[PDB]
Amino acid sequence: SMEQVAMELRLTELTRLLRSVLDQLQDKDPARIFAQPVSLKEVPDYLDHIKHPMDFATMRKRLEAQGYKNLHEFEEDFDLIIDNCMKYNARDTVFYRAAVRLRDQGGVVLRQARREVDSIG
Known part of the structure; x- marks a missing residue:
């Protein structure tokens, strides 16, 4: 149907906007701490601590x-990246601190993203 195509175009355009959001948030992680899944080879107990890993x-x-x-x-998955790290790692660690900085800097980006998603529909 034409309605299904229209809905699909809306999803494609949201995907475009979320791709730009994702790029902007990942620039706030210049150390690449959150770039990839925590390795279960290297942190074998991880899934005992963290039930829904994200990266x-x-x-x-x-x-x-x-x-x-x-x-x-999308925001749910970004919050998992931050929140997982802030539970697994202690306050005094470069990992925890990176997550704080990503959360703080990312909030700015997400606030305008929300306006754009509502604005454009």
């Missing part, structure tokens, strides 16, 4: 399959 590469795979239906779903 920027995993988000990009979902994004490219158009697997985010709305901005809330």
Whole structure:
């Protein structure tokens, strides 16, 4: 149907906007601490601590399959990156501190993203 195509175009355009958001948030992680999944070879106990691991590469795979239906779903995955790190790692660590800085800098980007998603529909 033509309605299904229109909905598909809206999803494609959201995917475009989320790709630009993802690029902007990942620039706030210049150390690349959040770029890839925590390695279970290198942190064998990880899944005992963290039940829903997340990272920027995993988000990009979902994004490219158009697997985010709305901005809330995308934000959920970004918050998992931050929140997972802030539980597993202690306050005095470069990992924890990187997550704080990513959260703080990312909030700015996300605030305008929300306006754009509502504005453009």
